[PDB]
């Protein structure tokens, strides 16, 4: 409808990735590790990735054990393309593993001209009294991946925003390397 619902709590940008520059035009994709804060372009495509350092990412990258709900907003930009000529599609997948044997936990398809905005959420829950340790060998725990596929790199330029639900809990410290400034 003409009237949209108003968002409330603050989301923070965390990860961005630009499709490869022209003359690139092949269908491509990029994977976001929503917990460890990693961006992995598919194949050798020249994706201009970048990661920020908000409280949320600082928590996700240092909290050993996690439990709770995470809200994710995916923004898709957003290039100077005449609407009538738009043919870019966005396919996104939530995954618990990048191994071929694992199936998608959730699929969304976005065919909006210009730009798009997708809201969804997922739960972090593991075997340690409800806590999960993102890819630890213990109990074969794994992280969460957000796979983004772009059918037209010249029309589509991705932004991941995140928010912790009040039920989100953490414990334990991970020794991270220094975090480079944006």
């Amino acid at each position: 409808g003409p009237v949209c619902a108003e968002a409330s709590d603050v989301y923070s940008p965390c990860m961005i990735a630009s499709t490869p520059p022209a003359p690139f035009s092949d269908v491509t994709a990029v994977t976001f590790d929503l917990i460890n804060g990693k961006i992995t372009p598919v194949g050798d495509d020249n994706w201009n990735t970048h990661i920020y350092n908000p409280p949320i990412m600082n928590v996700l990258r240092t909290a050993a054990w996690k439990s709770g709900t995470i809200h994710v907003q995916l923004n898709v930009r957003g290039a100077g393309v005449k609407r009538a000529d738009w043919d870019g599609q966005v396919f996104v997948y939530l995954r618990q593993s990048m191994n071929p044997e694992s199936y998608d936990a959730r699929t969304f398809v976005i065919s909006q001209p210009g730009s798009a905005m997708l809201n969804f959420s997922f739960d972090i829950i593991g075997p340690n009294s409800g806590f999960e340790f993102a890819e630890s060998p213990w109990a074969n725990q794994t992280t969460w991946y957000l796979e983004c596929v772009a059918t037209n790199p010249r029309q589509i330029q991705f932004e991941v925003n995140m928010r912790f639900d009040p039920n989100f809990r953490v414990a334990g410290n991970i020794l991270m390397p220094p975090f480079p400034l944006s």
């Binding site: 949320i56 990258r61 050993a64 054990w65 340690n128 809990r169 020794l175 390397p177």
Partner: protein, 369 residues
């Protein structure tokens, strides 16, 4: 003789338990070079790996018992004459992500011990290797990749004649393994932070040495073009403003011979150096006996008018910074009979009656040391 083997008590799933002797499972050596310095890693391995090659009464029980409800106790034995002193820190971390920082700031945070061999004969500590549960196992710490390190926070005040070997003794105790879990309630009775506020080097002399350290503890520690962060601080940075009762642990990291009276008070960045009226502010006088090396500071909510920001933009000057700072002031003069600088370590233990306000959108820049 025949016997119903099935009915035998061979399904004993109880945890390790008994005397200290029959609960020891491993011992290690930490080589302290007589010439070492701050930030100098002494030991860096996996917690699990501690058991390799060990032959103690509970080594087997530790490794085979698939569930333990007790805690891991670490006893450190090391001692050096009063002529010197240093600061050793032992810390337990849940895991790593390659080429990690070894700075005391990052290394501590979770579980740790800080002591000075020039004051203590030994030192001990218990911990819950499973920070969010009531039980754990050797297999768990192996596959979860639990780490432990020993690091020289402050170098020797006076170098030892020869290298020193500190010894660690690992055992299981019957203390109930209680969890430490962080959450987003905006009102909490106790929030553990273990933040390394800083290493205060006060050189010997008759100058007025003043040190400042912000209570705007979020954002991490400024390294270079990057910064250090640990879970407790990233958690506190979730809120925009906060307040509560502060509990600090002050550690004498220099030898007993290096002395200086230190004043602690909370004020603002408007106070300049060379201001002999600091004592006007409510303050605490900290002195240490040759035996002593640890003093707890308490700053109740009556020390603060309002809450204050978890982060500020690093370009903000002291004058322009309206958030409170903890001042460490040489009340008299730093001296001794030997050379060396009075290193004093300050750690924010935690917050009592914690109030968290709003929500921090976040600042990428840290705050600088």
């Amino acid at each position: 003789m025949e016997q119903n083997l099935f009915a035998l008590s061979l399904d004993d799933t109880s945890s390790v338990r008994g005397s200290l002797l029959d609960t020891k499972f491993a011992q290690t050596r930490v080589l302290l070079s007589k010439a070492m310095a701050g930030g100098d890693v002494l030991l860096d391995e996996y917690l699990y790996d501690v058991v390799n090659g060990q032959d103690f009464r509970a080594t087997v029980a530790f490794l085979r018992t698939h569930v333990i409800t007790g805690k891991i106790k670490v006893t450190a034995t090391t001692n050096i004459s009063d002529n010197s002193g240093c600061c050793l820190m032992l810390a337990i971390n849940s895991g790593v992500r390659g080429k990690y920082s070894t700075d005391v700031y990052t290394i501590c945070s979770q579980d740790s011990m800080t002591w000075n061999p020039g004051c203590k004969k030994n030192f001990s500590f218990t911990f819950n290797p499973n920070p969010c549960g009531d039980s754990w196992s050797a297999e768990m710490i192996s596959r979860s990749r639990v780490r432990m390190t020993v690091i020289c926070v402050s170098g020797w005040t006076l170098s030892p004649t020869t290298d020193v070997i500190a010894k660690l003794d690992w055992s299981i105790v019957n203390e109930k393994c209680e969890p430490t879990i962080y959450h987003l309630a905006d009102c909490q009775n106790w929030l553990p932070l273990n933040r390394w506020m800083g290493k205060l080097t006060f050189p010997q002399g008759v100058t007025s040495e003043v040190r400042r350290m912000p209570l705007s503890i979020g954002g991490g520690a400024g390294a270079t073009q990057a910064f250090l962060a640990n879970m407790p601080n990233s958690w506190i940075s979730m809120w925009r403003y906060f307040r509560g009762e502060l509990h600090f642990e002050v550690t004498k990291m220099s030898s007993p011979y290096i002395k200086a009276t230190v004043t602690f008070l909370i004020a603002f960045g408007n106070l300049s150096d060379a201001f002999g009226f600091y004592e006007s502010f409510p303050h605490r006088i900290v002195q240490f006996a040759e035996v002593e090396e640890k003093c707890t500071l308490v700053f109740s909510q009556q020390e603060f008018v309002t809450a204050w920001s978890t982060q500020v933009n690093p370009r903000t000057t002291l004058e322009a910074d309206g958030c409170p700072y903890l001042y460490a002031i040489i009340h008299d003069s730093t001296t001794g009979t030997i050379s060396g600088d009075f290193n004093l370590g300050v750690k924010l233990v935690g917050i009592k009656d914690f109030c968290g306000i709003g929500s921090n959108p976040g600042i990428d820049g840290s705050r600088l040391l």
